[PDB]
Amino acid sequence: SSLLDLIWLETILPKTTSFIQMKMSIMVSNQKGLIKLYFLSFLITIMISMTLFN
């Protein structure tokens, strides 16, 4: 009743997925709105696209 059904079966599939998605959402959406970082990342991805793929 408690150890597997209420705790571990919840911890494995739903709770872990929710935690991971929440953490990734926080990481993605936490941008200060400063374009310095945006265009620095733009330069990085432009160089990466030029070099790695071809």
Binding site: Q21, V28, Y38, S41, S49, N54
Partner: protein
């Protein structure tokens, strides 16, 4: 602004898009992009405030950089072959540069950072225009040059767009940011099928445009830009909230609604090309978009949030201005699945 000047600017935006769509010379396509941006900048600042100016300047910076890289790719393609016609490119470096420029224009990740900010800064009507009409020209150019695109880069940015939209939409209470992230995810879905079939790209574009038009017109009707301001709508006009919930369910790809039609077909097409892992990842990722659509539906129509006392006075007034084609948009965004085989019309 003056209504005549507003009509002139809107017509100039549409004329730039049409000039991109109807021309076969790369210089004319670049000119059409330039005209589209030049006429679009004022529309974003139709209501003057610091936020609108910030959105307009960010949009101008990104679009000007994208146009300059577009011209760079065009001139390199001319260098390695004296051709001005828009066809398969003759140089790989120019091809990657053109792909990145068009991805920046569309908002595909990692060039997605400007979309939520520009959408939040501008009003709802400008956001509707930006998220619907501004996706036509770059997608038309991509459909024209699809045969030369490298699948690896194009699909990498498609999958990145889907993942980024799904993750970024989960953290938003503002409705315009939610719309921007949803648009990023749908552009990611659109892009992932360009190497294999452009008819599927056009089908997804049309369905998404219908769904976004319905969403934005419903948001304009109930003048709400946040979750909590929208939560008050049930106490004035519940029919709007019910239609909005059905539209949100359709946008999440739930069968038997219209939003299931693109993904389904897209998956089908990808399966024809021995691609199995990517469609699976894309579907499980679109589950995130469905999640935050469901959260919006929960806070909007499936529960009744507390109201305010002044609401009573708003009960005595009707909407003076009506948006025509709203019922048509809702019906076309919810109940067109049984007519899926019409895509042979090459929409």
């Amino acid at each position: 602004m003056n209504p005549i000047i507003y009509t002139t600017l809107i017509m100039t935006v549409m004329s730039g898009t049409m000039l991109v769509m109807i021309s076969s010379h790369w210089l004319l396509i670049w000119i059409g992009f330039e005209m589209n941006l030049l006429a679009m900048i004022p529309v974003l600042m139709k209501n003057f405030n610091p936020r609108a100016t910030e959105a307009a300047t960010k949009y101008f910076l990104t679009q000007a950089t994208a146009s300059m890289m577009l011209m760079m790719a065009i001139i390199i393609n001319l260098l390695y072959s004296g051709q001005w016609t828009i066809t398969k490119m003759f140089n790989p470096v120019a091809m990657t540069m053109m792909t990145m420029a068009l991805a920046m224009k569309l908002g595909l990740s990692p060039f997605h950072f400007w979309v939520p900010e520009v959408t939040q800064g501008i009003s709802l009507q400008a956001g509707l225009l930006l998220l619907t009409w501004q996706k036509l020209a770059p997608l038309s150019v991509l459909c024209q040059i699809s045969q030369s695109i490298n699948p690896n880069l194009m699909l990498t940015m498609a999958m990145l767009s889907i993942l980024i939209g799904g993750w970024g939409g989960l953290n938003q209470t503002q409705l315009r940011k939610i719309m921007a992230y949803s648009s990023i995810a749908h552009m990611g879905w659109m892009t992932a099928v360009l190497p294999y079939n452009t008819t599927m790209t056009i089908l997804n574009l049309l369905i998404y445009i219908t769904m976004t038009l319905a969403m934005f017109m419903l948001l304009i009707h109930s003048s709400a830009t946040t979750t909590l301001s929208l939560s008050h709508t049930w106490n004035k006009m519940p029919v709007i909230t019910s239609l909005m919930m059905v539209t949100l369910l359709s946008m999440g790809g739930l069968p038997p609604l219209s939003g299931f039609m693109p993904k389904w077909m897209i998956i089908q097409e990808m399966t024809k090309n021995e691609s199995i892992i990517m469609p699976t990842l894309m579907a499980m990722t679109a589950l995130l978009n469905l999640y935050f659509y469901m959260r919006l539906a929960y806070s909007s129509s499936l529960t009744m949030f507390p109201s305010t006392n002044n609401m009573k006075m708003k009960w005595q007034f009707e909407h003076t201005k009506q948006m025509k084609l709203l019922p048509t948009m809702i019906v076309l965004s919810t109940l067109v699945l049984p007519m899926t085989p019409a895509l042979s019309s090459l929409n």
